[PDB]
Coordinates of N, CA, C and O in Angstrom, one line a residue:
X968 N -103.0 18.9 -73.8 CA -103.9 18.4 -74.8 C -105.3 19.1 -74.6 O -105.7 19.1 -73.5
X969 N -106.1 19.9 -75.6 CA -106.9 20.2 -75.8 C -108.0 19.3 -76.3 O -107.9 19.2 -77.6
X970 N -109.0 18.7 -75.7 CA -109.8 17.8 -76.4 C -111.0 18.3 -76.7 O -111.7 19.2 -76.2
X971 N -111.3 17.4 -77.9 CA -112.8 17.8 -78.9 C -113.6 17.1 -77.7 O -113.4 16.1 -77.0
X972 N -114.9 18.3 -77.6 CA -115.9 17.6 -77.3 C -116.1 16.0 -77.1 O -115.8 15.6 -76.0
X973 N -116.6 15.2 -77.8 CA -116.9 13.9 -78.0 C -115.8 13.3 -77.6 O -115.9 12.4 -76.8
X974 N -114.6 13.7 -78.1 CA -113.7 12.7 -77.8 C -113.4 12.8 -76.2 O -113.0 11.8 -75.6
X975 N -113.6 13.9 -75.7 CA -113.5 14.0 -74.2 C -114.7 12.7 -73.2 O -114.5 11.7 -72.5
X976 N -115.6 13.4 -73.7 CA -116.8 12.3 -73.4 C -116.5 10.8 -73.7 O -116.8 10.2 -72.8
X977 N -116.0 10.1 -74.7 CA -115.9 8.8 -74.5 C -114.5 8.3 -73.8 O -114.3 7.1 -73.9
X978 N -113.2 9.4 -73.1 CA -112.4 9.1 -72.9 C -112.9 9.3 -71.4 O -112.2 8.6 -70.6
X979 N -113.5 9.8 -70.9 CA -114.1 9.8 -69.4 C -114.8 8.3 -69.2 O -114.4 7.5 -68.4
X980 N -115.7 8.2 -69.9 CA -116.5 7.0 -69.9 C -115.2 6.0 -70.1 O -115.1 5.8 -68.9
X981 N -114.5 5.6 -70.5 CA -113.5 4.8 -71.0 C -113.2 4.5 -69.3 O -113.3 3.4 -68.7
X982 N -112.9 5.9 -68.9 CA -112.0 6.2 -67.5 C -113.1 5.7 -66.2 O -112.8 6.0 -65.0
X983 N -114.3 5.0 -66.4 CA -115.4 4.8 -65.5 C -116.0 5.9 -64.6 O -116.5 5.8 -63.5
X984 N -115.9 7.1 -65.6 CA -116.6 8.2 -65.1 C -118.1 8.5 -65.4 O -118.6 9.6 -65.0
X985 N -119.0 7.2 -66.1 CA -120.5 7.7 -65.8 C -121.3 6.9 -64.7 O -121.3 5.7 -64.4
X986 N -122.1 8.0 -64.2 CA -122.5 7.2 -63.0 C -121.6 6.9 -61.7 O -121.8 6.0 -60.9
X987 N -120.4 7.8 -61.8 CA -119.6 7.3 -60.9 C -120.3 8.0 -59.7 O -120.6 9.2 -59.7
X988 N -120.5 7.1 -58.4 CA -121.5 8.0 -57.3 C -122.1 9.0 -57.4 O -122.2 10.1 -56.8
X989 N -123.0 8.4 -59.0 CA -123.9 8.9 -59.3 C -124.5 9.8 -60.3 O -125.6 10.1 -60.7
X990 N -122.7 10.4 -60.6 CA -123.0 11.9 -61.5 C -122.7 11.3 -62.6 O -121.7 10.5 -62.7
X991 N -123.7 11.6 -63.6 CA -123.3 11.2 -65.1 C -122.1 11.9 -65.8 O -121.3 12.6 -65.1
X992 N -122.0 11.5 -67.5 CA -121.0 11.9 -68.2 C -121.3 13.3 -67.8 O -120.8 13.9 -66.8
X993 N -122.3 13.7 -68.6 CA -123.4 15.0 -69.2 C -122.1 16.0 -67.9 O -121.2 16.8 -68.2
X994 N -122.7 15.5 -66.5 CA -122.0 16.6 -65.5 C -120.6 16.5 -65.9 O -120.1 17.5 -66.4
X995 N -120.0 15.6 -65.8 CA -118.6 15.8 -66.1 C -117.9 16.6 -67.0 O -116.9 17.3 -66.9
X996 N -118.6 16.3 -67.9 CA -118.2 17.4 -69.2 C -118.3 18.9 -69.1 O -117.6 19.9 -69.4
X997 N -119.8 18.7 -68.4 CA -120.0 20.3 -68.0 C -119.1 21.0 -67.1 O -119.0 22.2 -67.4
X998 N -118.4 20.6 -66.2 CA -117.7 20.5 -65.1 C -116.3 20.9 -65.7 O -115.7 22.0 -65.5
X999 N -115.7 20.0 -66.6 CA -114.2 20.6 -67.1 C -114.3 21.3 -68.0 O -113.3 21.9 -68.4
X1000 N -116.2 21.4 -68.9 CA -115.6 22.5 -70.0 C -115.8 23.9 -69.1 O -115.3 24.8 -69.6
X1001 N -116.1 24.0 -68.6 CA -116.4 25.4 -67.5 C -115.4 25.6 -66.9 O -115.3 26.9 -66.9
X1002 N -114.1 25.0 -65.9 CA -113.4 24.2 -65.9 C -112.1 25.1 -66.8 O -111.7 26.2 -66.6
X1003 N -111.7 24.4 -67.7 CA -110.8 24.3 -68.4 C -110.7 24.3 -69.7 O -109.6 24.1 -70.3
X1004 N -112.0 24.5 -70.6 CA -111.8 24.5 -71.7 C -111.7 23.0 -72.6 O -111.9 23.0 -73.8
X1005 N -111.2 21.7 -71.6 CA -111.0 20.3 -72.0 C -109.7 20.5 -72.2 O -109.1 19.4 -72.5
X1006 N -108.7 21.7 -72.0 CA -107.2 21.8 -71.5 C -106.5 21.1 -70.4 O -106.5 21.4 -69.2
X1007 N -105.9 20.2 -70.9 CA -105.2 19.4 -69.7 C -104.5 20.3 -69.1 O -104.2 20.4 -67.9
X1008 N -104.0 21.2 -70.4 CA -102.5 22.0 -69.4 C -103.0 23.5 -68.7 O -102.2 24.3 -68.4
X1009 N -104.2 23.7 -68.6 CA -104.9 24.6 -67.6 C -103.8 24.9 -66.6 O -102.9 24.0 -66.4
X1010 N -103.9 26.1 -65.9 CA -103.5 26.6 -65.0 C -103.6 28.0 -64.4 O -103.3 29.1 -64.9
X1011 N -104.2 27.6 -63.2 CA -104.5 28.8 -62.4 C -104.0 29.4 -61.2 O -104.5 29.0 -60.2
X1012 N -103.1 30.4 -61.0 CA -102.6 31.0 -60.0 C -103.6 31.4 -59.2 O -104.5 31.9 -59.8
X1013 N -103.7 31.3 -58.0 CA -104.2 32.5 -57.1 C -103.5 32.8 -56.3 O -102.8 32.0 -55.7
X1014 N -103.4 34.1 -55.9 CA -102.1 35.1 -55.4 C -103.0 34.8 -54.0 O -102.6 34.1 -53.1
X1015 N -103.9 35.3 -54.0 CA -104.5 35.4 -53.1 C -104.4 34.4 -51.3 O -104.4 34.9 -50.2
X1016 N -104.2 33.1 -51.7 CA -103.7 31.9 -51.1 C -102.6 31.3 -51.6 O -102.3 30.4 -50.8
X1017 N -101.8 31.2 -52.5 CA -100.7 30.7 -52.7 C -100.8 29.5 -53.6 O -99.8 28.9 -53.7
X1018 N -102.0 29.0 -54.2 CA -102.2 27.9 -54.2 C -102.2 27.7 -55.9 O -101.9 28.7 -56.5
X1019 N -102.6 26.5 -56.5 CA -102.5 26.4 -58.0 C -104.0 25.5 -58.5 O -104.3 24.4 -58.1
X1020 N -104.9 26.1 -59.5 CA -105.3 25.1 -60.1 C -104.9 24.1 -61.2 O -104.4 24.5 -62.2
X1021 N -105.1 23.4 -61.0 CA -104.0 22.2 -61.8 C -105.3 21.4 -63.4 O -106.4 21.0 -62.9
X1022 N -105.3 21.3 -64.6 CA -105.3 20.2 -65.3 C -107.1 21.2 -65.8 O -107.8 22.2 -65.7
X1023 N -107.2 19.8 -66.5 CA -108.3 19.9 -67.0 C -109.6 19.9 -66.1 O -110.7 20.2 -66.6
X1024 N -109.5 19.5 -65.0 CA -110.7 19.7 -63.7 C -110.4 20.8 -62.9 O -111.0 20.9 -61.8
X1025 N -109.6 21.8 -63.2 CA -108.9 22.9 -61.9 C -108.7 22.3 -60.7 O -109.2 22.8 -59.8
X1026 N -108.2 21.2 -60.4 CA -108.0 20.8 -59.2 C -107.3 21.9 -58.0 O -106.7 22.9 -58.4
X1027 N -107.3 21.7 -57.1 CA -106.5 22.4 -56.3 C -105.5 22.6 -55.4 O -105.7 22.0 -54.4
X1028 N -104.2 23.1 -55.4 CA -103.1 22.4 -54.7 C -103.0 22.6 -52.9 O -102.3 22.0 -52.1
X1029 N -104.0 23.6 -52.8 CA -104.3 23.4 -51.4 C -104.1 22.4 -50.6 O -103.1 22.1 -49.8
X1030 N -105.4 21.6 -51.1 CA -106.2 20.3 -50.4 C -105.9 19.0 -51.1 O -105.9 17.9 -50.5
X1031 N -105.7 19.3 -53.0 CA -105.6 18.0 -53.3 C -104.2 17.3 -54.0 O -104.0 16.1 -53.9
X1032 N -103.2 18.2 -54.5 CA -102.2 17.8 -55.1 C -101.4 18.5 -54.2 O -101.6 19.5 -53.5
X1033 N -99.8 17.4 -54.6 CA -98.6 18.6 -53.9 C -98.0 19.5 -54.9 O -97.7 18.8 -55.9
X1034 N -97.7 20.5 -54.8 CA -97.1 21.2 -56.0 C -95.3 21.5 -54.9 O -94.2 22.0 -55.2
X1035 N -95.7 21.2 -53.8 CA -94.5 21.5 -52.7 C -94.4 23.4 -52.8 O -93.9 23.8 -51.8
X1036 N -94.8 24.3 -53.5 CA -94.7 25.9 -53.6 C -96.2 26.2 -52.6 O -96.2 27.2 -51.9
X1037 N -96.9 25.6 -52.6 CA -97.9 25.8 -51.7 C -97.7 25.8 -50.4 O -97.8 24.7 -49.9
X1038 N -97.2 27.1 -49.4 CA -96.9 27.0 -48.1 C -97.8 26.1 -47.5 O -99.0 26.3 -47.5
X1039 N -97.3 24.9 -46.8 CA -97.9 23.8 -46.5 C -99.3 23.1 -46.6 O -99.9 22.6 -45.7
X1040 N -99.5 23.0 -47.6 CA -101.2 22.6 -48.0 C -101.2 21.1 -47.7 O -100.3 20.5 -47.2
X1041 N -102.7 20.5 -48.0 CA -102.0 19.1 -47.9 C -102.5 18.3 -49.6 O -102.9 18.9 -50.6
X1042 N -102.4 17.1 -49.2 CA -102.3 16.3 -50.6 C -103.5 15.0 -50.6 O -103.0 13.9 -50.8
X1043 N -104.8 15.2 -50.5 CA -105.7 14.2 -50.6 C -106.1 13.3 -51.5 O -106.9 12.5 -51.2
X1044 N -105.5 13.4 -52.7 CA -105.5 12.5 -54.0 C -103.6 11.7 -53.7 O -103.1 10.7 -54.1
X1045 N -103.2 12.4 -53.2 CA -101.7 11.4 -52.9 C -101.1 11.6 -54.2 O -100.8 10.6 -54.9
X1046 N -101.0 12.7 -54.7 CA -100.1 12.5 -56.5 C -99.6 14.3 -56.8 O -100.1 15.4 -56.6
X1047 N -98.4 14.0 -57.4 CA -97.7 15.7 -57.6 C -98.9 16.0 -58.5 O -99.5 15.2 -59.3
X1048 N -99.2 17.6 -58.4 CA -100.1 18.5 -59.1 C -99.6 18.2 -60.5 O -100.5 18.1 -61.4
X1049 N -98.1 18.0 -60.9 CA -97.8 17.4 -62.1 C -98.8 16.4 -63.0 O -99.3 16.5 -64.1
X1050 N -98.8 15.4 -62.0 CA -99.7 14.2 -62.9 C -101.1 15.0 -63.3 O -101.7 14.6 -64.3
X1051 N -101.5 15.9 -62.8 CA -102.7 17.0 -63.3 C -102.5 17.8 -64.7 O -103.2 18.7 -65.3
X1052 N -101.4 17.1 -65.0 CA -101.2 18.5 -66.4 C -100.5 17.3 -67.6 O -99.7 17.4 -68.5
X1053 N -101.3 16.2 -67.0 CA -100.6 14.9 -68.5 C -101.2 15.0 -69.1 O -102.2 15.5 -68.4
X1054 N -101.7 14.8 -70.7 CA -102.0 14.6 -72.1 C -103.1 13.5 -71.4 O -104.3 13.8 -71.3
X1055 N -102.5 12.2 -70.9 CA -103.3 11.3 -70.3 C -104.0 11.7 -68.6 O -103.5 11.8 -67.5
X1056 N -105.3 11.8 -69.1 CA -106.0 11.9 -67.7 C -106.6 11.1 -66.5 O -107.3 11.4 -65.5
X1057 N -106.0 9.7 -66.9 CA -106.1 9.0 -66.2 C -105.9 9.4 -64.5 O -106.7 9.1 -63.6
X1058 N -104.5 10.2 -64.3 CA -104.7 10.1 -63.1 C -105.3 11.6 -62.3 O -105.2 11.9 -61.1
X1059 N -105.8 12.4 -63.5 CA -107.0 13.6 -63.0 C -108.2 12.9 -62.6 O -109.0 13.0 -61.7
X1060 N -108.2 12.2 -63.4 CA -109.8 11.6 -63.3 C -109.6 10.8 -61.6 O -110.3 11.2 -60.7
X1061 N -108.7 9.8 -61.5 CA -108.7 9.3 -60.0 C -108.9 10.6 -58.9 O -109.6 10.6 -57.8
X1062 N -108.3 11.5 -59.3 CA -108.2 12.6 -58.4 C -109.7 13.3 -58.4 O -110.2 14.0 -57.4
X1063 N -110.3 13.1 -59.3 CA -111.4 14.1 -59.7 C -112.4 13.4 -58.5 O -113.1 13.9 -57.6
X1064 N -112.2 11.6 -59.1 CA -113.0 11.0 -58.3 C -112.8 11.2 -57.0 O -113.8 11.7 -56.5
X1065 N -111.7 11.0 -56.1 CA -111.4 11.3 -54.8 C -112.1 12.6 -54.1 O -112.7 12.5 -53.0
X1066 N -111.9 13.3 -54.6 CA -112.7 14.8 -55.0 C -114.2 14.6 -54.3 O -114.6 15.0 -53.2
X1067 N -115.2 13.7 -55.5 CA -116.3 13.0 -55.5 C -116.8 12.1 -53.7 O -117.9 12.1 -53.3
X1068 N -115.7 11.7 -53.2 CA -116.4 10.9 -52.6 C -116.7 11.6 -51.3 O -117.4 11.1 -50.4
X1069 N -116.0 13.0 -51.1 CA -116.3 13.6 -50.3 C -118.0 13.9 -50.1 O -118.7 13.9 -51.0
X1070 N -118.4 14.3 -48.8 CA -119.7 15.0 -48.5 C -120.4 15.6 -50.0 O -121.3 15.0 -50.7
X1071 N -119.9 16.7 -50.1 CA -120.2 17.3 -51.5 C -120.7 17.1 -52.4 O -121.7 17.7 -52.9
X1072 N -119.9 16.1 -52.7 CA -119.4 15.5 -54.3 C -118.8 16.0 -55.1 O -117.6 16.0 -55.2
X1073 N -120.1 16.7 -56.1 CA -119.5 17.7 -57.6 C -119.8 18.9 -57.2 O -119.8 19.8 -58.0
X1074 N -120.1 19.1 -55.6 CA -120.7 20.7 -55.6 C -119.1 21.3 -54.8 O -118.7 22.4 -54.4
X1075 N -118.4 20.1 -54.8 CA -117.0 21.4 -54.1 C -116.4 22.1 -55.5 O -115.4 22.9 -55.4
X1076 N -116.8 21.9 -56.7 CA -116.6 22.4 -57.7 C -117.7 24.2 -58.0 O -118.9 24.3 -58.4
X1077 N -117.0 25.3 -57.6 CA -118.3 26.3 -57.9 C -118.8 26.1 -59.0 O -120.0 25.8 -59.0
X1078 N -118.0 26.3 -60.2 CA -118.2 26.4 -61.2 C -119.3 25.5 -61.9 O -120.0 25.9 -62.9
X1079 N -119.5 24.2 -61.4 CA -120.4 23.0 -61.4 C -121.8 23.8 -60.8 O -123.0 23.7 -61.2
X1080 N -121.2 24.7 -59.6 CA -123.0 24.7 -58.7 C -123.3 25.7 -59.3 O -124.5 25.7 -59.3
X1081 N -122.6 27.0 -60.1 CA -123.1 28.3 -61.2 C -123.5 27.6 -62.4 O -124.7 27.8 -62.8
X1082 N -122.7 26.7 -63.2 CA -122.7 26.2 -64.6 C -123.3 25.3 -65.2 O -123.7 25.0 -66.3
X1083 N -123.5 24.7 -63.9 CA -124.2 23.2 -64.2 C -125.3 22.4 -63.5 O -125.8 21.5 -64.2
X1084 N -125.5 22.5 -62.6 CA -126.1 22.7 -61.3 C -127.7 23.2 -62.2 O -128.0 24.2 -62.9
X1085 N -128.6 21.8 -61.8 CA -130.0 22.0 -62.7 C -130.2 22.7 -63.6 O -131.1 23.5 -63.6
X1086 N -129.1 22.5 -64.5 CA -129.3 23.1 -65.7 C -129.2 21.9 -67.1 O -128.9 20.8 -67.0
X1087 N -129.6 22.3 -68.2 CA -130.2 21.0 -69.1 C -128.7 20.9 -70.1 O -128.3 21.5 -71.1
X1088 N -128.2 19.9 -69.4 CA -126.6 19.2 -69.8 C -126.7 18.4 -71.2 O -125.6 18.4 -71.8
X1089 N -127.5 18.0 -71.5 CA -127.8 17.0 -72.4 C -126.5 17.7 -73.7 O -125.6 16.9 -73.7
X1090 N -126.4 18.2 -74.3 CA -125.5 19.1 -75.0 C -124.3 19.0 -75.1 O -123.7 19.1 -76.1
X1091 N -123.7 18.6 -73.6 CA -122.1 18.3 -73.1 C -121.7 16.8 -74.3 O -120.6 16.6 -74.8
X1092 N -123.1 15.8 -74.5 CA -122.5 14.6 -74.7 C -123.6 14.1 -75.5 O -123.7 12.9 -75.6
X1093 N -124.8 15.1 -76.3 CA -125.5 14.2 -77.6 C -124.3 14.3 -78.7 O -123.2 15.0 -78.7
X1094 N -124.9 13.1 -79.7 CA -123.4 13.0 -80.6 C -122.5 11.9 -80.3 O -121.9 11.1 -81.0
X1095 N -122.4 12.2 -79.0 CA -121.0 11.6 -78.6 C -120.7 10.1 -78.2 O -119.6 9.7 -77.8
X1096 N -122.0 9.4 -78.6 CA -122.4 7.9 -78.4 C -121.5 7.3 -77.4 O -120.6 6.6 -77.6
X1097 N -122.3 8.0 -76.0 CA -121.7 7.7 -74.8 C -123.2 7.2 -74.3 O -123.3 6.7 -73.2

């Protein structure tokens, strides 16, 4: 599923993603449109490590999903890279969050510390009566 703008934004919020430890909508949006386009069925090879980005957050099958093709990575959200590529994002978003409660946070995302990262977000989610 490819989602419109707004409608992404009030389905994150829906999902208890504003303010979640802290990071508003605004980042989130910024985050998977940079991300993935709001493409659930995103996907990214890297040859390089063996590994897959998964869904509308690029998760990664390294560290967070199992995809089992990944010579032994491990699995810190506990769910196949599969559930990363549903129409329903309910269980990206748990994973996103998991993601979140690390040290980090939203900065294990590059694309977040290039894209979004004190930059003026407001854009991801006026309109969008979130």
């Amino acid at each position: 599923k490819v989602f419109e703008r707004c409608e992404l934004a009030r389905t994150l919020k829906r999902l208890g993603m504003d303010g979640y430890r802290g990071i508003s909508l605004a980042n989130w949006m910024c985050l998977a449109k940079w991300e993935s386009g709001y493409n659930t069925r995103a996907t990214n090879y890297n040859a390089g490590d063996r590994s897959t980005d998964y869904g509308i957050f690029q998760i990664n099958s390294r560290y967070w999903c199992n995809d089992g093709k990944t010579p032994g990575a491990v699995n810190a959200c506990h769910l196949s890279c599969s559930a990363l590529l549903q129409d329903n994002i309910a269980d990206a978003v748990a994973c996103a969050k998991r993601v979140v409660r690390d040290p980090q946070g939203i900065r294990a995302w590059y694309a977040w510390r290039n894209r979004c990262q004190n930059r003026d977000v407001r854009q991801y989610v006026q309109g969008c009566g979130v």
